[PDB]
Amino acid sequence: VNSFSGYLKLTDNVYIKNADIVEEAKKVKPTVVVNAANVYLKHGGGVAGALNKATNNAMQVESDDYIATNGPLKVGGSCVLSGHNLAKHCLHVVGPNVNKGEDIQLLKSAYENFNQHEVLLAPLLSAGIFGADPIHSLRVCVDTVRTNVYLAVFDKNLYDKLVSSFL
Ligand SMILES: O=C(O)[C@]1(F)CN(c2ncnc3[nH]c4cc(F)ccc4c23)CC12COC2
Numbered sequence: 128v129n130s131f132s133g134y135l136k137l138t139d140n141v142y143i144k145n146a147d148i149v150e151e152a153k154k155v156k157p158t159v160v161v162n163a164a165n166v167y168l169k170h171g172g173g174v175a176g177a178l179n180k181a182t183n184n185a186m187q188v189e190s191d192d193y194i195a196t197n198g199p200l201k202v203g204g205s206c207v208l209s210g211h212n213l214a215k216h217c218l219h220v221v222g223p224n225v226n227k228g229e230d231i232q233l234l235k236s237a238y239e240n241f242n243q244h245e246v247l248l249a250p251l252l253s254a255g256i257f258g259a260d261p262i263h264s265l266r267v268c269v270d271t272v273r274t275n276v277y278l279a280v281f282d283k284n285l286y287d288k289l290v291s292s293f294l
Contacts, residue, residue, distance in 0.1 A: 141268060142278065143278045145280055147281055148178070152181075152214050156215075157248040159210070160178070160214035162186075162218070163255070165221060165224065166202060170190065172256055173257070181212070181213060193206065205221065206219050220240050222259070225253070231253070237253070238252060241272045242274055250280075262292055265289055
């Protein structure tokens with residue numbers, strides 16, 4: 128038993144809710160919250176900008192030190208940093224950004240990072256400002272992640288569509 132509430136069960140291991148991931152993290156304080164990161168960990172907008180804002184920019188400060196030491200992530204890659212006031216840990220995962228011309232096949236590699244964590248609160252990778260089809264992203268999630276994932280979908284209209292079209 129865990130503390131996630133109000134989710135619809137899609138599969139054995141994948142759950143979904145119409146929720147603001149920031150507000151959900153603040154209430155659950157999960158072990159792992161996933162950020163929709165870019166390779167530079169520049170948390171300007173989308174989910175990343177919202178998570179970083181909720182940390183009062185501490186996420187960005189930590190991220191800048193990480194990049195100064197390690198260089199950029201790979202598209203499809205990840206790193207574990209602090210969850211600050213939102214979670215124990217933040218798993219920064221880089222899905223391909225279609226608005227940058229990145230290969231959508233890298234979306235499966237991005238979701239594979241979730242399998243290193245038993246339970247996660249996460250957004251749909253490559254959705255939103257990353258330009259991928261969220262229905263495709265949900266399908267890849269279900270077909271790739273084997274650990275327990277709680278997906279927060281900000282937009283109510285999209286949430287209803289994802290549920291109603293789910294096979
Ligand atoms: O338009 C988009 O880019 C998205 F809708 C944003 N995403 C989110 N997903 C969960 N929680 C969220 N909280 C937020 C708070 C904000 F200020 C901004 C965004 C989100 C968000 C998912 C989305 C990207 O694929 C759909």
